[PDB]
Amino acid sequence: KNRAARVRVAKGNKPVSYEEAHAPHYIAHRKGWLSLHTGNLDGEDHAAERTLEDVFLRKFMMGTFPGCLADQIVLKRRANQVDICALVLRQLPAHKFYFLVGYSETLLSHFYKCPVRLHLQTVPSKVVYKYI
Amino acid sequence: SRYAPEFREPLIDKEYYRKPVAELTEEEKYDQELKKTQFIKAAAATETSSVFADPVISKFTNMMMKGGNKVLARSLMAQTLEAVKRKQFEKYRAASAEEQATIERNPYRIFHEALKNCEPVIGLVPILKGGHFYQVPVPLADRRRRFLAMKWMITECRENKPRRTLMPEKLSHELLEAFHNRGPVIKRKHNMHKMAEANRALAHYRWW
């Protein structure tokens, strides 16, 4: 049996998001890609360096916004600009988000030497695609 | 298969399509009208309306082919037919007018009548009686009877020949010696019949 990235069935009480519900074979069919860069296109270089930055950028955002992430973040690279689009729960006060945005942007712009912007869409609570 | 089960085997008979409508039996006439609404399989690369195409020889060629080498197997069959035509012309020219009449110089007619002679009618088969298998004489079907004649020919020539002889020279000499019913392949037919004779006692075991 295949165990890869499959949220298995319980007794109908496990909420799962759209991203979690779909197994790997639905990638490019029902669900898209969380990161969009040009490094895996044919005749393009620096796939390894873009992929390592993604791993870190995801671990950074989880720790910097602990318990405030409704879904996995979406990374969008255009030219040298990096754009982070994160669904965040409305747990923290509003002013705290302004602090963490200023901090996380400046810190990641001086770490990778690129302009990095954070885009936050706040949800009242996690969106449930289906109960499995 | 890449052909859905709704596809129909092609009919590549030139005269059939050009026959007058009234000459066709209504059963044949019915299929033509039905086929206008059906799908038709593409014809094979070896399927043609040629007047020189013989299915029996085309099948015999495929049973000699090794590893998809159709050119070599077809070449060997062409050399065989020629080796038989050249062997009968020599005999015809070196024969009296009376003898000349009997001599057959058509290689296609020597090939067909040679194979038919080798065909075995009844061969032993394993049949289950009381949860036990017995060798009971059975009537061989048409397809199995035809297959056995060709297989026995291609196997006598392939194996039981000198090292320096060639297949067009052993096959020609065997088709000709099976056109007169005096060959090793005919002896193999006489063994299958001889063995069924010994086991005739178990004939009634057959349930069809």
Partner: protein, 260 residues
């Protein structure tokens, strides 16, 4: 071969090389030449040709007589004036000299032809082999060249227009040719730059495929001998089929009809 028959019946002296590719490939005995140590001698190839040349021109082998003395061995020589048949006889008797008897024969006929004694048809089929490449290797495992071979070198002189008293009839054959494409038939493609320059000015005579009249004549000839034994061959649909598959090519028509 049609030209060789016309000349043969008028009492010409036929010097017919049946295939010239056989002299540049698949040689199992390749000796060296005493006359010139650079050159090599093909004993078996020369011996076979001489026996055929003897049969064709047996009549003229007593009339023509050598104009010089040829020392085959220390103990054997040909006195001037003796019949040309003696040169041929020694070549067959002693295979070592066979490649040298041929050279004497070609030299004598070329010189004596101009004297008006006889006409000489030098008919070489497969002439493209002379100025091409070989598949023969020296003791060092290095490929030989056509000039090096003795038989090839002698013949290259006979196909030159520096003599008179006869005619040279040449033919090109890509079949059996070495290092040439399957679809090469034109004179420059097969002869090359060396062969073309050697033979010019030459008269090219194109041999085409059977025309409608010739194809019917060939079709009836096979039917006249009972060769086309298939029942449908005599019919108009058989003939039309055989015309398409053969394409009126003489060889292909013979091959297709052979199986039928």
């Amino acid at each position: 071969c049609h030209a060789v028959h016309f000349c043969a019946r008028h009492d010409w002296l036929i010097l017919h090389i049946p295939d010239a590719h056989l002299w540049v490939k698949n040689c199992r005995e390749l000796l060296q030449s005493t006359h010139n140590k650079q050159r090599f001698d093909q004993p078996l190839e020369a011996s076979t040709w001489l026996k055929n040349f003897k049969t064709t021109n047996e009549r003229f082998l007593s009339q023509i007589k050598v104009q010089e003395k040829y020392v085959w061995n220390k103990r054997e020589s040909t006195e001037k004036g003796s019949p040309l048949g003696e040169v041929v006889e020694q070549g067959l008797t002693r295979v070592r000299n066979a490649t040298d008897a041929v050279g004497v024969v070609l030299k004598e006929l070329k010189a004596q032809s101009a004297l008006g004694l006889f006409h000489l048809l030098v008919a070489v089929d497969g002439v493209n082999a002379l100025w091409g490449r070989t598949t023969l290797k020296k003791e060092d495992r290095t490929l030989i060249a056509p000039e090096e071979l003795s038989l090839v070198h002698n013949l290259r002189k006979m196909v030159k227009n520096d003599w008179h008293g006869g005619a040279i009839v040449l033919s090109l054959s890509q079949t059996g040719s070495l290092f040439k494409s399957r679809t090469a038939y034109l004179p420059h493609e097969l002869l090359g730059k060396e062969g073309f320059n050697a033979l010019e000015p030459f008269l090219p005579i194109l041999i085409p495929n059977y025309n409608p009249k010739e194809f019917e004549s060939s079709f009836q000839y096979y039917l006249e001998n009972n060769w086309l034994q298939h029942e449908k061959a005599s019919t108009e649909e058989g003939r039309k089929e055989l015309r398409f598959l053969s394409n009126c090519n003489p060889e292909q028509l013979e091959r297709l009809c052979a199986s039928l």
